[PDB]
Short mmCIF file of C-alpha atoms and ligand atoms in Angstrom, two decimals:
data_model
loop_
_atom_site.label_atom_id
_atom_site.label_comp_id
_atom_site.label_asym_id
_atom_site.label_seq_id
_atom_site.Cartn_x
_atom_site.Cartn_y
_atom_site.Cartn_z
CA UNK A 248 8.11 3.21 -24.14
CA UNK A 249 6.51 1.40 -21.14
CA UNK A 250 9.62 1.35 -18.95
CA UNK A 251 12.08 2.11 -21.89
CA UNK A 252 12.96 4.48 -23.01
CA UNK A 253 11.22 7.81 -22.29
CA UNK A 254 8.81 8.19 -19.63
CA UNK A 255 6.80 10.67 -21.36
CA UNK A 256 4.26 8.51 -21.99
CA UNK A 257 2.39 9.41 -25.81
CA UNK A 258 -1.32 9.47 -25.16
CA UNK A 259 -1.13 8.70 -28.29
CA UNK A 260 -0.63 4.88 -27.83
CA UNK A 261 -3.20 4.94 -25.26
CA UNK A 262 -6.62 3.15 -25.82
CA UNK A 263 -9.23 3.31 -23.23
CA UNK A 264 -10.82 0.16 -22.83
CA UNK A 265 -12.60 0.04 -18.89
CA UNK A 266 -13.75 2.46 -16.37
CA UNK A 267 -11.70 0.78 -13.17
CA UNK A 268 -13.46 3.76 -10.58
CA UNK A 269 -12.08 6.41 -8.70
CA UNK A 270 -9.66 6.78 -6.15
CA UNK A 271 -7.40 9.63 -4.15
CA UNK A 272 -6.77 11.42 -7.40
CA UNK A 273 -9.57 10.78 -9.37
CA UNK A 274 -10.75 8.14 -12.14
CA UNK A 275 -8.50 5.38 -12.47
CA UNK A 276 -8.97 3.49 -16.20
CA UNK A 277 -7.67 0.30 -17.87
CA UNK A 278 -6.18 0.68 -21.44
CA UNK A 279 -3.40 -0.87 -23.25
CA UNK A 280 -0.43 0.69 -24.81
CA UNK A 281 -0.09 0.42 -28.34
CA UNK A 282 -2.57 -2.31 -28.70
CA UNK A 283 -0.76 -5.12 -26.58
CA UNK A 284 0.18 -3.81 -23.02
CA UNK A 285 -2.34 -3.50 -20.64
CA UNK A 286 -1.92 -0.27 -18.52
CA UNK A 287 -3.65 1.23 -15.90
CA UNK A 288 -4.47 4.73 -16.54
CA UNK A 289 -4.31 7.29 -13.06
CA UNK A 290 -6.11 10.76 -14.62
CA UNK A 291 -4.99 13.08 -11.82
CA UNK A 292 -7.66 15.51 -11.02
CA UNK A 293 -6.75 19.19 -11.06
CA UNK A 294 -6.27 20.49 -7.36
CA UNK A 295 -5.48 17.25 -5.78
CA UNK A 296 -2.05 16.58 -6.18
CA UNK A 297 1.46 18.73 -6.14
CA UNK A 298 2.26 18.30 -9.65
CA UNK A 299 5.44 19.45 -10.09
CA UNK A 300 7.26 17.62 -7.16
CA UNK A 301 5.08 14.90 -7.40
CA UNK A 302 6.82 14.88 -11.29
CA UNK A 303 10.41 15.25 -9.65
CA UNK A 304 9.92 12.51 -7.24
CA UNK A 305 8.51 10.42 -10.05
CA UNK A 306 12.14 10.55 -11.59
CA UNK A 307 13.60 8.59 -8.42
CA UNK A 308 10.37 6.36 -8.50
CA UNK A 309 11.64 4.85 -12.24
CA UNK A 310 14.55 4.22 -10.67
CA UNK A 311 12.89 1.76 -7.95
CA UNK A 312 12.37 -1.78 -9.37
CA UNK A 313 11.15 -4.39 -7.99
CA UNK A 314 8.71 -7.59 -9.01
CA UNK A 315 6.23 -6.85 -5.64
CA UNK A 316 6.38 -3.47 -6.85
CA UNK A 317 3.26 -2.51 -8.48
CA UNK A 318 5.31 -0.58 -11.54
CA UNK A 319 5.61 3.16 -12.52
CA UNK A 320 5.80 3.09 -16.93
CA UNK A 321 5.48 6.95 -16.74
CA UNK A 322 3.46 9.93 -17.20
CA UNK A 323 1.50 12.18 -19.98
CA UNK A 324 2.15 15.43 -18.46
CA UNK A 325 1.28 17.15 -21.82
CA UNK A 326 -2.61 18.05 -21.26
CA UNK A 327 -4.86 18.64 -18.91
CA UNK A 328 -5.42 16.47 -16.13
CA UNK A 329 -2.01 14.77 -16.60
CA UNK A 330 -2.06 11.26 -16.29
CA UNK A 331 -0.07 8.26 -14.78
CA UNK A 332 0.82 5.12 -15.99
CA UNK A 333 1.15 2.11 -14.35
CA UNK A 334 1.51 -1.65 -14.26
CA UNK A 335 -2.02 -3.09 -14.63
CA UNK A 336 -3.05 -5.46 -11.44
CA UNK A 337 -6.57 -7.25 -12.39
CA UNK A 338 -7.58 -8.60 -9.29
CA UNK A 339 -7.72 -5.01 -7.89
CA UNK A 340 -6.71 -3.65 -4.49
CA UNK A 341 -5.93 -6.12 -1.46
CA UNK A 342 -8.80 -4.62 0.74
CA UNK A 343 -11.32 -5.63 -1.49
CA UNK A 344 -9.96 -8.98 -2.16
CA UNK A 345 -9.58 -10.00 1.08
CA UNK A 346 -13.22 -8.86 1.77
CA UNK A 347 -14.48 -11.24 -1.27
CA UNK A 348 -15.69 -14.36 0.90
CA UNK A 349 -15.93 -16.47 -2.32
CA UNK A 350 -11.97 -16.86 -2.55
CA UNK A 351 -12.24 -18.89 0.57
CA UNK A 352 -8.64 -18.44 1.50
CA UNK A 353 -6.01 -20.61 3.26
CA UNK A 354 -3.82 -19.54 5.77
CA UNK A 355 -1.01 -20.28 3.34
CA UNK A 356 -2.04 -17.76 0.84
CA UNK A 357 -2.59 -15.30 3.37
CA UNK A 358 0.61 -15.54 4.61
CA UNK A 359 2.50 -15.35 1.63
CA UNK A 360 0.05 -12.51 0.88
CA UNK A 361 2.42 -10.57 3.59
CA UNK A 362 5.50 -11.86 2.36
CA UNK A 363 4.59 -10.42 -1.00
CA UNK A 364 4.36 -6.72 1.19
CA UNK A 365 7.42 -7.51 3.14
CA UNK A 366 9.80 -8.01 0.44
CA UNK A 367 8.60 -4.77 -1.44
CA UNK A 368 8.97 -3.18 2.13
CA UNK A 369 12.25 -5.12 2.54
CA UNK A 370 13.59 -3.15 -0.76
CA UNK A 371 12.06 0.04 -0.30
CA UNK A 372 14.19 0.28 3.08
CA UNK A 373 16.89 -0.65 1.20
CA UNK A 374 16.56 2.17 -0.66
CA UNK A 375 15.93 4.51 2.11
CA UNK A 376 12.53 5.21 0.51
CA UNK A 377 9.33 5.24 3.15
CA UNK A 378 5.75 4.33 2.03
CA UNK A 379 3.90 6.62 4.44
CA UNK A 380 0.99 5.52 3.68
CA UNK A 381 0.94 1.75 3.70
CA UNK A 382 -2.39 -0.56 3.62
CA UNK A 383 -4.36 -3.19 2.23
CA UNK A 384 -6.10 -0.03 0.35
CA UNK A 385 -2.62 0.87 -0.96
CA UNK A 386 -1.66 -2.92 -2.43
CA UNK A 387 -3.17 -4.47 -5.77
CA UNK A 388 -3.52 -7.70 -6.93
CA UNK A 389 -2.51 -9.22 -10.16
CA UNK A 390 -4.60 -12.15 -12.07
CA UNK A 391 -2.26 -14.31 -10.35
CA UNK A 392 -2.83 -13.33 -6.76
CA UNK A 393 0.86 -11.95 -6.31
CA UNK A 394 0.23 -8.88 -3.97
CA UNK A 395 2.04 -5.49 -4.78
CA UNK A 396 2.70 -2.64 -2.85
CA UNK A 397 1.52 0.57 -5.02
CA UNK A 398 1.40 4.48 -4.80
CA UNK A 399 4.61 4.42 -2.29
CA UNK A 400 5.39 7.99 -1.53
CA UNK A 401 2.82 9.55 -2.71
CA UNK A 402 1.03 10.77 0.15
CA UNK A 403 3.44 13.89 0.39
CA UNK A 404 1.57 15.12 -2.62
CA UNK A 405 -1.70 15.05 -1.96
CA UNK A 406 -3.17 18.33 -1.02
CA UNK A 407 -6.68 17.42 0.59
CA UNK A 408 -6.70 18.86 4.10
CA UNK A 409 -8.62 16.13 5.38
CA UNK A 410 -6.02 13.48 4.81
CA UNK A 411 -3.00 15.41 5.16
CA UNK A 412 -4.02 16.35 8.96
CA UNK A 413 -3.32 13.56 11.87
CA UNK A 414 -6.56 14.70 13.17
CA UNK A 415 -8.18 14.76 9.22
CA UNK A 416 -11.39 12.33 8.72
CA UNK A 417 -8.93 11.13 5.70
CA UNK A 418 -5.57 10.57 7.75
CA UNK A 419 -4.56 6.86 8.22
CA UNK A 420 -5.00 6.79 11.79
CA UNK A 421 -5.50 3.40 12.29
CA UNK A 422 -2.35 2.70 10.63
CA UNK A 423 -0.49 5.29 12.56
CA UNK A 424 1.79 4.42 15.59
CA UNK A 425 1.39 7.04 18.48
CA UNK A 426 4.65 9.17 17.73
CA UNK A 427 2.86 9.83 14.14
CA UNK A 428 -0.21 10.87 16.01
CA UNK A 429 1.34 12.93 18.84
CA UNK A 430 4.51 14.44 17.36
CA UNK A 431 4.57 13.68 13.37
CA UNK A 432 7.86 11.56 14.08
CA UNK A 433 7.83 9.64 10.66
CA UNK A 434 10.18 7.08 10.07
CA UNK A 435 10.92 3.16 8.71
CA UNK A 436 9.50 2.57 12.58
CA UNK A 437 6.04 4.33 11.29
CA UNK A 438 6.07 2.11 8.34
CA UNK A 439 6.97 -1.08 10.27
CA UNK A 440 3.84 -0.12 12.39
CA UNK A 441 1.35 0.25 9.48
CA UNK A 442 2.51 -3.58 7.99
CA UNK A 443 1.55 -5.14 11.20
CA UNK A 444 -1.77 -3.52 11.05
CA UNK A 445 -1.96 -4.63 6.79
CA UNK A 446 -1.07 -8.11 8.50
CA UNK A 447 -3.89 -7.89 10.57
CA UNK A 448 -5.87 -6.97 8.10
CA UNK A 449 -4.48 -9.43 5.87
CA UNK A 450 -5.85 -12.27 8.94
CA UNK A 451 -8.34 -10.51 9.74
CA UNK A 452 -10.12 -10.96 5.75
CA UNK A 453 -10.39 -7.11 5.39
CA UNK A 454 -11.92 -5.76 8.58
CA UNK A 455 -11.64 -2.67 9.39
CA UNK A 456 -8.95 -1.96 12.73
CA UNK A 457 -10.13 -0.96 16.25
CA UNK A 458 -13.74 -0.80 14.31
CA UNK A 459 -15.44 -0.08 17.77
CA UNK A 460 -13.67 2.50 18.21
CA UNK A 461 -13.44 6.16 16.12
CA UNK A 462 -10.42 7.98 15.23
CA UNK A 463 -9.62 10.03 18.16
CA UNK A 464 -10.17 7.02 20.31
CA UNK A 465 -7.68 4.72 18.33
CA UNK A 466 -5.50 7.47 18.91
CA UNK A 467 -5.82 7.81 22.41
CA UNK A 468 -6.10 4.44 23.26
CA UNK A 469 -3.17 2.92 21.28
CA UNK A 470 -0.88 5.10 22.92
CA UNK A 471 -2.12 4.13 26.07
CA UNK A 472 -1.14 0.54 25.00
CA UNK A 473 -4.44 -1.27 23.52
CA UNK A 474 -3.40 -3.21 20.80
CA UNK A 475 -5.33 -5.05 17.78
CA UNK A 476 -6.18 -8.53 19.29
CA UNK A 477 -5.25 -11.56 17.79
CA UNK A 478 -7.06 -12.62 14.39
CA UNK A 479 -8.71 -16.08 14.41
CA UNK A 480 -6.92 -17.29 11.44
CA UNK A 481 -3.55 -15.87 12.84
CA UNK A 482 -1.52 -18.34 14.94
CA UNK A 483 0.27 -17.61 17.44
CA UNK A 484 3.77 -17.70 15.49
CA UNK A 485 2.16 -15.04 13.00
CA UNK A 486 0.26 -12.88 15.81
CA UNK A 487 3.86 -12.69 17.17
CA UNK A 488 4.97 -11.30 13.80
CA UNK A 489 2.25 -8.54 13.41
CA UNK A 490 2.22 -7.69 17.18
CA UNK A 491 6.30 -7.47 16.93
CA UNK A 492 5.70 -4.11 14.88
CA UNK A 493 3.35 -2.02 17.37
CA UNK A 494 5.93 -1.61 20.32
CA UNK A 495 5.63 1.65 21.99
CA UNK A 496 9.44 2.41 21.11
CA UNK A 497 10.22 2.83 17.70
CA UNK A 498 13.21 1.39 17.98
CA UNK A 499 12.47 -1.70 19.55
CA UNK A 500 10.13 -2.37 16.64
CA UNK A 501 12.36 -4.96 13.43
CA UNK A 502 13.57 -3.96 10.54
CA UNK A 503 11.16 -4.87 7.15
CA UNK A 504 14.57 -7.53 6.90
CA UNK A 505 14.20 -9.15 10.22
CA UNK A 506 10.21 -9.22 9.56
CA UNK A 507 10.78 -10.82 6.02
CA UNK A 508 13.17 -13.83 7.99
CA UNK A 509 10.22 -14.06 10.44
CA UNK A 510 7.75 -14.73 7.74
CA UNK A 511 10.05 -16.79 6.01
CA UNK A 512 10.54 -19.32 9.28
CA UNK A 513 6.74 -19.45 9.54
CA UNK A 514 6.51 -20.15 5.32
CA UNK A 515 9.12 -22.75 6.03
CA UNK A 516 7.21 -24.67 8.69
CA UNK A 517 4.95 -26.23 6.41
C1 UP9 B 611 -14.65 -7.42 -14.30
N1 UP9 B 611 -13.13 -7.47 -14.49
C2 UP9 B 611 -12.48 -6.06 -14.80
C3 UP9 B 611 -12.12 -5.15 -13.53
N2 UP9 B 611 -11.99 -5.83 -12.16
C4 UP9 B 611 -11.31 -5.22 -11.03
O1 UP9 B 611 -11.33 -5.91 -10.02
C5 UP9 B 611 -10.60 -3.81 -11.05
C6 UP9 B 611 -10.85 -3.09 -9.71
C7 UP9 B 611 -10.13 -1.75 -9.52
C8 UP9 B 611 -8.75 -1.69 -10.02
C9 UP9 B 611 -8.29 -2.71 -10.83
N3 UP9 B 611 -6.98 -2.42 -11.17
C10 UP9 B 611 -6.60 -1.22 -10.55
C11 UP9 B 611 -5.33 -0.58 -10.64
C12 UP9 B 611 -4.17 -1.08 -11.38
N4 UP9 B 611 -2.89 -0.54 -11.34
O2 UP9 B 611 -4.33 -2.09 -12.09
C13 UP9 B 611 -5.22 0.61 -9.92
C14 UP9 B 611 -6.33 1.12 -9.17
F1 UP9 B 611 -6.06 2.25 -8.56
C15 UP9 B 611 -7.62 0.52 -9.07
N5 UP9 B 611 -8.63 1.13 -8.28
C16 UP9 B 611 -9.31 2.40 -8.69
C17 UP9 B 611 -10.60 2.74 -7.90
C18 UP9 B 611 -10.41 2.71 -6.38
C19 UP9 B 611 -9.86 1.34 -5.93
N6 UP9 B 611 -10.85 0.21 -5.98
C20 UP9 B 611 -12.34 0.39 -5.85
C21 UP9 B 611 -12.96 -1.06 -5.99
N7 UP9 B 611 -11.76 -1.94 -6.18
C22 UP9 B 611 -11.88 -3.41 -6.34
C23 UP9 B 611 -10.55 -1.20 -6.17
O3 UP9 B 611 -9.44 -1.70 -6.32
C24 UP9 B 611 -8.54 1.15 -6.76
C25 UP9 B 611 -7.72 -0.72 -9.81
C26 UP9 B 611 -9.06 -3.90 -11.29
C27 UP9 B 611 -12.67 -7.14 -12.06
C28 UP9 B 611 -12.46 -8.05 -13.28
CL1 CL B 612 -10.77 -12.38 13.29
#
């Protein structure tokens, strides 16, 4: 089924309905399953992924649940490519959303926009599972604005050189702290440090980080100690919050809990 049941999905009970683009892997679709669930459809190009333990890892993924967690149903392994099946999201990924000026956001929904992120962060940590790859690319939207944190993980199965070297035109170093960039020391720490940059993205209505600056500056500079500055629409309270999760030390930076309480205090303000 669609998270019952077996997780080979039939491709069977798949109908193609939209083209949604391409992505890391390859051409993304909308479809339902079995004429009523709406499902988007991940066809995994040949060469670009580690299939088989991208497929073991995929058995702990089922086992992760929660409602900001965009969803895994399963996978048609069967044929080639192989596909995966997920939780359809209509409004698309965060980046773009935030970039569409018509929405005409308030602060409030940007804000809860992060607390959406932090709780999925909040359980992932509670699961011991890191993102590695967290962004406003990396989150979807549903057709009721909730934000979802999608593809967790999956970076340690891509196989494109480019993004799988810190010095790669495809690496996420603007989401990087400095002991990813200088040492590969991954941690929760490295994911605290990419959600204050997706906050500053989030209050920043999708611009890009450091923008003046390329990749190997970012790098250098960052570790030096510049920092993203604050975003007009970001008060004080919230520039706090995002700022909170760049400290040099990785261990001075909060947990995903204590940033969740700190989002909260702000939420409960109003
Ligand atoms: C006209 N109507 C039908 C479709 N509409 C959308 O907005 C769709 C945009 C893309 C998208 C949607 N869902 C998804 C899901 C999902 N699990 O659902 C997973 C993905 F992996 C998507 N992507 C693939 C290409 C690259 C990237 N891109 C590239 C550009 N973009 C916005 C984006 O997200 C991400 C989409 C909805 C508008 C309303
Ligand atoms: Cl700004």
């Amino acid at each position: 089924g669609l998270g019952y049941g077996s997780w080979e999905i039939d491709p069977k009970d798949l109908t193609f309905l939209k083209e949604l683009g391409t992505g890391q892997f390859g051409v993304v679709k909308y479809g339902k399953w079995r004429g009523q669930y709406d499902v988007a459809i991940k066809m995994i190009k040949e060469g670009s992924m580690s299939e088989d333990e991208f497929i073991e890892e995929a058995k702990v993924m089922m086992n992760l649940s929660h409602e900001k967690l965009v969803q895994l149903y399963g996978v048609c392994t069967k044929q080639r490519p192989i596909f995966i099946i997920t939780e359809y999201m209509a409004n698309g990924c965060l980046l773009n959303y935030l970039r569409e000026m018509r929405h005409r956001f308030q602060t409030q929904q940007l804000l809860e926009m992060c607390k959406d992120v932090c709780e999925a962060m909040e359980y992932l940590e509670s699961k011991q599972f890191l993102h590695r790859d967290l962004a406003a690319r990396n989150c979807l939207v549903n057709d009721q604005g909730v934000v979802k944190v999608s593809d967790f993980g999956l970076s340690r199965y891509v196989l494109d050189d480019e993004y799988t070297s810190s010095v790669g035109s495809k690496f996420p170093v603007r989401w990087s702290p400095p002991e990813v960039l200088m040492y590969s020391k991954f941690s929760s720490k490295s994911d605290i440090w990419a959600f204050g940059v997706l906050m500053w993205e989030i209050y920043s209505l999708g611009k890009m980080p450091y923008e003046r600056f390329t990749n190997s500056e970012t790098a250098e500079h960052i570790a030096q100690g510049l920092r993203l500055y604050r975003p007009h629409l970001a008060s004080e309270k919230v520039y706090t919050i995002m700022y909170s999760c760049w400290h040099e030390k990785a261990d001075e930076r909060p947990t995903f809990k204590i940033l969740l309480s700190n989002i909260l205090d702000v939420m409960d303000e109003e």
